[PDB]
Design a protein around this ligand. Sequence first.
Ligand SMILES: CCCCCCSC[C@H]1CN(Cc2c[nH]c3c(N)ncnc23)C[C@@H]1O
Ligand SMILES: CCCCCCSC[C@H]1CN(Cc2c[nH]c3c(N)ncnc23)C[C@@H]1O
Lengths: 229, 229
Amino acid sequence: GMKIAILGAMSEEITPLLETLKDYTKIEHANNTYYFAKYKDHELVLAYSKIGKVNSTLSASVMIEKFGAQVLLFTGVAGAFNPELEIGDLLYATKLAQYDLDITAFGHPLGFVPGNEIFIKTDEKLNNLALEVAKELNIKLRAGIIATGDEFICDEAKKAKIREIFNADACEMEGASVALVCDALKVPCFILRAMSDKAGEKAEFDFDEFVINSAKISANFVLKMCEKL
Amino acid sequence: GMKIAILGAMSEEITPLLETLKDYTKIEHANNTYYFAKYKDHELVLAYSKIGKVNSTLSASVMIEKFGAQVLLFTGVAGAFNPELEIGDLLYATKLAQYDLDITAFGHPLGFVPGNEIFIKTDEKLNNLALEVAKELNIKLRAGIIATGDEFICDEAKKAKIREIFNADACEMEGASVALVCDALKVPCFILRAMSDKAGEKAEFDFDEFVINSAKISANFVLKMCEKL
Ligand SMILES: CCCCCCSC[C@H]1CN(Cc2c[nH]c3c(N)ncnc23)C[C@@H]1O
Ligand SMILES: CCCCCCSC[C@H]1CN(Cc2c[nH]c3c(N)ncnc23)C[C@@H]1O
């Protein structure tokens, strides 16, 4: 079996996995805790990064460069843009962009810097495995584009703009950064999100109400994927 | 001697060091090139990260976690906010914040996420070493606060807002993220910037005109610091 990283942003996104696993060891590193467990012939490394692009980049980098992760599964919640998504629905990202990476003053498109592309892709084999798991367990699973940036979106105008520019189905604050790290380090990456809110007026209240439950839905799914890897 | 990382964002910020060093080895890693050289009893690792917070976070993490850097010196250019700064002037950061890290919907201040602080500090001993180098070489050196985010600022209103909220003397797109990584991994960090522009109307044109020269000023200074480490 391979060494698998499971990464979230907040305690709520990862604690459900630790409760399921029960037996694990801890290491304090990178001003955070990294958790180690054996599960179905796989060595797991788990952590929550803390919120946002920088924190999630650091944790993905640590999990691969220091702890030797060979595959990385991201689990957590997101703000829904696609009106067909409801709170609780699962979306995996086929590709992701940073909507707030902006050198447009120099005539390049939003999300672009030299040497990189606007969109980073996730791993096709992991995505196909997720589709198999979803079918086997009768779980509804949607494929889409995720827009990542360092703002909590709770504004219909901003939602509409990001949706339009990137054809994005959801937003969050860690996906594109984690996917970029994994691509750069040649590690297959899967990004799964359960919707906690619709990223408009009162998104903060929906997020507060639904984060715990939506986080569990995503967490359960990525652990099921580990069984089939 | 210690293992020293020297990091910039763009080729212009690091190529002057490579030209001075002359002899070095290259390793392709993390969708980038990392350069290795010996200088005055120190093993150096150098790179330009590519632009922005995610790219710079990844490079700092790689330099420390994979290549074992024990100190990190960041060199490059910046947009001046403090009206006493002129193009070409050197500023080292005493502390830095991410102005575009925004969960203010939840009633926290701009730049804050739970588990972290608004400002990250750089290393006092390195900062004092820089002051000694500046005095010895008769170079004007200013201490200040740097605001970091993923936008090229070329707008007087944005400049004024970021300046006001963070009491920032300059802006750039990599400092706070690099400083955060170094702090998290217990590596002393120094962030030096030479002004390339004043971050208002026509900042893009000043940046184009002055980036090469200002980048050399910063690069020369960090190499002088390596001699005294
Ligand atoms: C008590 C501490 C204050 C709560 C701060 C919560 S920020 C949102 C979380 C959840 N995650 C995904 C996400 C869920 N909903 C989102 C939205 N509307 N905009 C941006 N991101 C998201 C990104 C980020 O990790
Ligand atoms: C086709 C040409 C594309 C050029 C794109 C250059 S973005 C600015 C650089 C330089 N660096 C520092 C910096 C210098 N001036 C800045 C400003 N006004 N705003 C934000 N950052 C900066 C950040 C970033 O690494």
